[PDB]
Amino acid sequence: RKISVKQHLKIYLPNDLMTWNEYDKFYTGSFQETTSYIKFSATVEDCCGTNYNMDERDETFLNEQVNKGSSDILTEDEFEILCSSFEHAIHERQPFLSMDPESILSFEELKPTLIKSDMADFNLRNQLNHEINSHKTHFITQFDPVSQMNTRPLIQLIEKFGSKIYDYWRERKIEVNGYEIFPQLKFERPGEKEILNSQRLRALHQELKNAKDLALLVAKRENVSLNWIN
C-alpha cells in the first residue's frame, strides 16, 4: 500500500460517487509604542542591577526602630541597595568562601579592600562625567531605576552609619551554609528535580571609534537644550 506523489491533478466538479486579588496597584501606568520596531540591547540583570533584596525579617529591627533617633535621616531606599553591593565588590577575592560560614571575613580587614573596590567596574560614569559635564544634574536613565535621583553616594552611608550593615548580614548564612536567600539553582549540576589580527579587523578601533568622537556631541545637541526653564 503506497502514498501519493507530485505532479498530479485534482478533479473538482464532475460525477464522483477566581482571579488573584493583588495586581491592580501592582501594574498601572502606560507604555509608549513607536510606529515601528524596537532595538533593545541592555541586559536584564543590570535592569535588576543587584538581584538582592532583603525581606521583613531583619529590617524589622531597623526601618521602624532605628529611624526614630537617626541624625542623618534613615530611609529604606538608601539601605537595601548598599548591602546588596559588596557581595560582588569582593567576589573576585574569596572563591574559597564555599565551605564554612565561620570563614566570613571582617570589615577591619575589609578596610583596604571594599572601600576602594569597584562593583563589576562600578564607577565608570564619574570619569565619564567630566567629558560629559552632567555635573549639575544627576546620572539617571530609565534603564536605571528612579531610586538614584533620591538615594545618595556610598560614602556617607558607611562613614556615617557603616558599623551596622554587615552585622545582621552575618548570622543568617550559617543556617543555609552561606547560601543566599535565593539559593541560585540546582547548579551543582545541570540535573533534575530535588593571524587574524593582522589584516582587516584593526578598524574595530576605527569604525566604532568614528562615532565616539561624535558621541561627545551626541549629547550636546540635547545637552544644550536644558538650561532654559530655570
Binding site: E207, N210, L214, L217, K220, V224, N227, W228
Partner: peptide, 23 residues
C-alpha cells in the same frame, strides 16, 4: 544668555558625511 556652544558646532556632520561612511 545661553547660545554659545549652540551655533559653533554644526558644520561637523557635513564635514562627517563625506568623511568616513561615504567610501
Amino acid at each position: 544668555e545661553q547660545e554659545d556652544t549652540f551655533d559653533n558646532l554644526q558644520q561637523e556632520i557635513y564635514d562627517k558625511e563625506t568623511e568616513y561612511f561615504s567610501h
